[PDB]
Amino acid sequence: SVTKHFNVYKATKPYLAYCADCGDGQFCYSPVAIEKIRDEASDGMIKIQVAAQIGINKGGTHEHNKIRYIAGHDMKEANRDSLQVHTSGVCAIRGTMGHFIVAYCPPGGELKVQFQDAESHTQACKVQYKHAPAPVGREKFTVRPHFGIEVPCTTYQLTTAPTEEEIDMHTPPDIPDITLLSQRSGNVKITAGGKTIRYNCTCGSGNVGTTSSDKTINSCKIAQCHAAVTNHDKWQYTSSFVPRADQLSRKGKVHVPFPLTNSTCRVPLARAPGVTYGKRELTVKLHPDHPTLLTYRSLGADPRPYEEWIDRYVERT
């Protein structure tokens, strides 16, 4: 019952797309890739979209110690605890499932998601994105108060439930592979394993697109062959980094988890200001701990509003 709704994840084998900065390198093709980012929660939450789904054991399941990244035209294996996301400060994960990630995360000028692969590599890549949260209330802080007041904010609660909006599924395109062009005696041979590789050549007759056959074109050269492999087995997410064939696209639906809900939200209470009133004039000593907001207005017909953030000791009149 709990694991019955993971059947939608029969769709496996996500893409290995193009991402800008390889970290160490300049450009690389990486199993992990940063996509659109959602940021509408009012308590500094984030929503990161990653091609490599998590919590997969070649079938529907939920766990905390298994990740299967994909490099090439086959599946692979790694460990979830090694997955790390960190901006300028440490970007801590509250709990994730599927293709999407959420995290408490300090402000910074860039984003990075990294995870250890099966052996001796820390392949990953960064992304440019700004994160400048607007804390609720008139006090700016980074840690929950020991004493404070309740003012609600919106956040993504942790559950696995169906939703309204959707992402797009479609048949994968035909990726190419040049390693299937092993020439041994001046003869062009097609190997096995990958199977049903599409074929097309100007080399001569015999351009049919052999399907799961060890067909061999004779007296030919590698430079005239441009074979590409296709499977038509499992459908895949539609990104802006892979091609697509013209068709209705057969939009498949996998519900986006972690919807947006109201919640109670604690906020600190500043120290009582020091007051020493005189004659028709009022004087206040302030002891701010962090940049806060102070404002006042006249109850008479002329408001004359004043607002000015305070972050240091200062006399005010």
Partner 1 sequence: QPGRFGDIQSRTVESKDLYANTALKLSRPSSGTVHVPYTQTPSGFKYWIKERGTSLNDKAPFGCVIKTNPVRAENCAVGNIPVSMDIPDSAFTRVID
Partner 2 sequence: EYKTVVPSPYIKCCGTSECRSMERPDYQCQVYTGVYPFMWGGAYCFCDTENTQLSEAYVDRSDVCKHDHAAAYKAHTAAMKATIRISYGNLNQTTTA
Ligand X SMILES: *[C@@H]1O[C@H](CO)[C@@H](O)[C@H](O)[C@H]1NC(C)=O
Nearest of 79, 19, 14, 8 to residue 51 by alpha carbon: 14
* # chain residues binding ligand X, by CB under 6 A: 6
Q: How far is the CB of 35 from partner 1 (least distance, A)?
A: 12
d(CA 177, CA 113): 28
For residues 124 and 115, the answer to whether their CB atoms sit within 8 Å is: yes
Q: How far is the CB of 101 from partner 2 (least distance, A)?
A: 17
Residue 207 touches which of partner 1, partner 2, ligand X, none (Cβ within 5-8 Å per kind): ligand X
Task: Examine residue 182 and tell whether it contacts partner 2 (CB under 8 A).
Answer: no
Task: Examine residue 202 and tell whether it contacts ligand X (CB under 6 A).
Answer: yes
Count of CA atoms in the C-beta half-sphere (13 A) of 310:
19
Q: How many other C-beta atoms can be found within 10 angstroms of the C-beta atom of residue 84?
A: 16
- What are the contacts of 20-27 at 24+ separation with CB within 8 A? 20/125, 20/126, 20/127, 20/128, 21/125, 21/126, 22/125, 23/112, 23/114, 23/124, 23/125, 23/126
Residue 37 touches which of a copy of itself, ligand X, partner 2, none (Cβ within 5-8 Å per kind): none
Q: Which of residues 68-127 bind partner 1 (CB under 8 A)?
A: none
Residue 313 touches which of partner 2, partner 1, a copy of itself, none (Cβ within 5-8 Å per kind): partner 1
Q: Tell me which residues touch ligand X (CB under 6 A).
A: 200-202, 207, 261-262
Contact footprint for partner 2 (CB under 8 A): 16, 29, 38, 40, 154, 164-165, 168, 170, 174-178, 200, 202, 224, 226, 228, 238-240, 242-244, 246, 249, 256, 260
